């Protein structure tokens, strides 16, 4: 009863089209973020998903009241009837303000005109990536929000408390498959748009990729294919179709693994770290078949040694060399590879 | 202080018909535009389109909004753009666009004491391309964005790129993963229809494709598989299973590469350049098995009625023919 005429008295002399203190001073908006669940980081789109309860607060002198209550916890219809800063995420792609079952917005008015206006957002944000250490890389995924129409002279953003404690990531909402979340970095910036200067808040979420999926699906297949293509030496030199079928099939296996591992990725112009590994392993399996061609150039007979003993063939010299040469070079390459890239 | 501003705004818009072009019987309005491109997200050959995010901005001088006394520029809430005139500009290349919604509908109204109004939109559109992929993946793709007034003809509305060549900004900040923008042009022209002549603008890029991704994925394993087709020349004619297995396995590997590239790529009627190259490599691979059939027939069939001379000749012929083919190929397209 009383609160009806209180709210009517508030909306009597009110305009929701112009900033509080339009010709007097800046409007200090005190922003705040509660990250409930940091959603899955789509590499192919170079994006990620985040769901946040987006807090804002400012002071409007026109919304002072006196009554039985201190704070008016209200319906979001009145939040649509009142000025609200046009905060937009600078790197959102297709972001959704949830309205099931009602628009998830709370407006709270304390009696001295200090508004609280929190939304519940899902921001499909744009994280530019440097995948040159794929998959053993790590990079900062930013989240940057400013006003759209109000300059530095009109609306200035802050954080409610100290910046690194303001943005809170909740614990139950991991929602990450590959990446790990090592922490955020809360800051503040200024842009220089054609229209004018603006205040830009910034959080940089830091993500290091777990390489367990990529080891299992790409590295151990390539490693065991190379182990196979080096097992071919311990056959004899006379089993020409055995070593022939052996070498060209492991080549086919490496070609299959090549295309089916590069598929899990965007189409960048350089070569990633997994590309270096796949190319070197494919060079080993290529060199195994060139080695057998070099063996078969010097065969000089047609049969092999019978168990009961004409001449025979000896075990060839490049066979005895390559049995020790190629697994040693593969072990050296593994040492150099997994000491180089697990440094960064 | 502030009630004067509210009074000024309320006396601007009382008696303001928003269904009327400014100077409704007189000269056309000179609507000037401005594009600040945020990103280009995907450039899809499958759907022949690309997603473009931009800060699309428009100036025009609406003479019925010319206030007085207030020394500043009236930056208002976005919902007062419902109570103004705005131009009906659309995009012909557009498939599915949206003004962003979080946290509000991203509009701006910035009034000026001469009556100039700015209307800014963060638009993420999806513009179409007639991609000519005959030189794929060694092509320069041209893609446009055709801005045009819908209802008002050239007698009612005029479009100029405000700033000349520096209207569209943010082009140099775009780092597409597999393209490289060479040029963007800014074309202003009138377009006739059955209903009249309308002003069209044209932001229009040129996307040149980075070429290293396909060398890694397709070209280099094609070269090395075609090379490993030639191990049969260093194997005896007696070893039948050896030469037949490598020749059969290399036509299988070329089959797998081509099936992967036909799964990636759209349904185009001609033969692309990467398909010309795989057809050429498959010709070498197929002839590397026809050679063994030829050798087997000459020895075992025309025997009682040279053999090693075929291998000695072909070891010189096939690397020379393959290098000659790559010479003609990579000097035709590159």
């Amino acid at each position: 009863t009383v609160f009806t005429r209180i709210l009517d008295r508030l909306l009597d002399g009110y305009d929701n089209r112009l900033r509080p203190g339009l010709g007097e001073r800046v409007t200090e908006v005190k922003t705040d973020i509660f990250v409930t669940s940091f959603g899955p980081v789509s590499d192919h789109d170079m994006e990620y998903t985040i769901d946040v309860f987006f807090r804002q607060s400012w002071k409007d002198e026109r919304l002072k009241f006196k009554g039985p209550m201190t704070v008016l916890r209200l319906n979001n219809l009145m939040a649509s009837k009142i000025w609200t800063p046009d905060t937009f995420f600078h790197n959102g792609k297709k972001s959704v303000a949830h309205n099931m079952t009602m628009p998830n917005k709370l407006l709270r008015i304390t009696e001295d005109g200090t508004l609280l206006y929190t939304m519940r957002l899902t921001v499909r944000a744009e994280c530019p990536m440097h995948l040159e250490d794929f998959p053993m890389d790590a990079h900062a995924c930013p989240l940057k929000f400013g006003s759209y129409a109000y300059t530095r002279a009109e609306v200035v953003y802050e954080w409610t408390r100290e910046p690194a404690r303001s943005v809170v990531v909740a614990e139950d909402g991991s929602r990450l498959n590959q990446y790990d979340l090592l922490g955020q970095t809360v800051d503040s910036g200024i842009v220089q748009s054609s229209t004018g200067e603006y205040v830009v808040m910034t959080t940089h979420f830091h993500l290091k990729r777990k390489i367990g999926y990529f080891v299992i699906q790409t590295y151990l297949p390539c490693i065991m294919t190379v182990i196979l293509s080096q097992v071919s030496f311990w056959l004899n030199r006379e089993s020409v179709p055995a070593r022939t079928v052996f070498g060209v099939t492991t080549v086919l296996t490496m070609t299959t693994l090549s295309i089916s591992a590069r598929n899990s990725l965007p189409k960048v112009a350089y070569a990633t770290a997994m590309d270096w590994f796949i190319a070197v392993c494919y060079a080993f399996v290529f060199s195994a078949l060139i080695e057998f061609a070099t063996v078969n150039y010097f065969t000089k007979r047609g049969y092999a040694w019978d168990g009961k003993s004409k001449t025979f063939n000896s075990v060839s010299k490049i066979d005895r060399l390559s049995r020790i040469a190629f697994p040693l070079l593969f072990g050296i390459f593994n040492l150099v590879y997994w000491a180089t890239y697990l440094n960064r | 202080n502030m009630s004067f501003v509210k009074e000024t705004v309320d006396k601007l818009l009382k008696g303001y018909d928003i269904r009327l072009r400014p100077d409704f019987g007189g000269p056309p309005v000179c609507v000037g535009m401005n594009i600040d491109i945020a990103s280009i997200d995907m450039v899809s050959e499958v759907n022949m389109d690309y997603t473009l995010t931009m800060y699309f901005q428009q100036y025009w001088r609406d003479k019925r909004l010319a206030y007085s006394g207030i020394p500043l520029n009236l930056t208002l809430d976005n919902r007062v753009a419902d109570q103004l005139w705005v131009p009906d500009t659309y995009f012909l290349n557009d498939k599915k666009s949206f003004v962003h919604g979080v946290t509000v509908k991203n509009r701006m109204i910035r009034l000026h004491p001469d009556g100039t109004v700015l209307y800014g939109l963060r638009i993420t559109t999806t513009a179409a391309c007639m991609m000519d992929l005959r030189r794929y993946p060694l092509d320069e793709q041209n893609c446009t964005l055709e801005i045009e007034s819908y209802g008002y003809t050239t007698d009612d509305i005029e479009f100029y790129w405000r700033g000349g060549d520096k209207a569209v900004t943010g082009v140099e900040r775009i780092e597409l993963p597999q393209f490289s923008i060479v040029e963007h042009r800014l074309v202003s022209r009138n377009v006739v229809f059955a209903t009249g002549a309308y002003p069209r603008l044209s932001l229009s890029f040129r996307l040149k494709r980075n070429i290293g991704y396909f060398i890694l994925q397709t070209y280099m394993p094609s070269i090395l598989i075609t090379i490993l087709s030639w191990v049969s020349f260093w194997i005896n004619y007696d070893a039948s299973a050896a030469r037949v297995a490598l020749g059969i396995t290399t036509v299988l590997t070329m089959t797998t590469i081509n099936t992967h590239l036909r799964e990636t790529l759209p349904k185009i009627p001609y033969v692309k350049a990467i398909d010309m190259y795989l057809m050429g490599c498959f010709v070498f691979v197929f002839l590397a098995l026809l050679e063994y059939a030829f050798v087997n027939y000459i020895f075992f069939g025309r025997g009682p009625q040279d053999v090693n001379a075929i291998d000695r000749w072909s070891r010189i012929v096939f690397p020379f023919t393959f290098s000659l083919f790559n010479l003609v190929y990579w000097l035709y397209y590159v």
């Epitope: 600078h90 790197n91 530019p128 440097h130 790590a138 990079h139 900062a140 930013p142 940057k144 090592l182 922490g183 970095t185 800051d187 910036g189 200024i190 842009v191 220089q192 748009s193 830009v200 910034t202 940089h204 830091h206 | 945020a38 140099e172 900040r173 780092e175």
Partner: nanobody, 108 residues
């Protein structure tokens, strides 16, 4: 006085990268002056907030720290930096590419 300290890169386009300027006073103290993101966002240090202006040219791959209001305490070495800011923009270890440095000396 005023000064325009530039940094013209080559070998890699750093448009994606956050090109920044560092000040090193004598005392082994790399200090973060200014850095600009790919999306035209200027980040300023606390001691220099409102004095220096940073501006990149993404065509020419440069960063241009404009100097103004030069106190005698700005006598130090000015490094051009570049990186991807993992645990970045406030730390010197986040940058994996560096300039040589330049002593800028103020005489009062």
């Amino acid at each position: 006085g005023s000064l325009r300290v530039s940094c013209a890169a080559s070998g890699r386009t750093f448009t994606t990268y956050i090109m920044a300027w560092f000040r090193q006073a004598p005392g082994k103290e790399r200090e973060f002056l200014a850095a600009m993101d790919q999306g035209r966002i200027q980040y300023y240090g606390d001691s220099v907030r409102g004095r220096f202006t940073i501006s990149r040219d993404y065509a020419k791959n440069s960063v241009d720290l404009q100097l103004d209001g030069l106190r005698p305490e700005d006598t130090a070495v000015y490094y051009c930096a570049a990186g991807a800011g993992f645990w970045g923009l406030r730390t010197a270890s986040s940058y994996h590419y560096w300039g040589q440095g330049t002593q800028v000396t103020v005489s009062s």
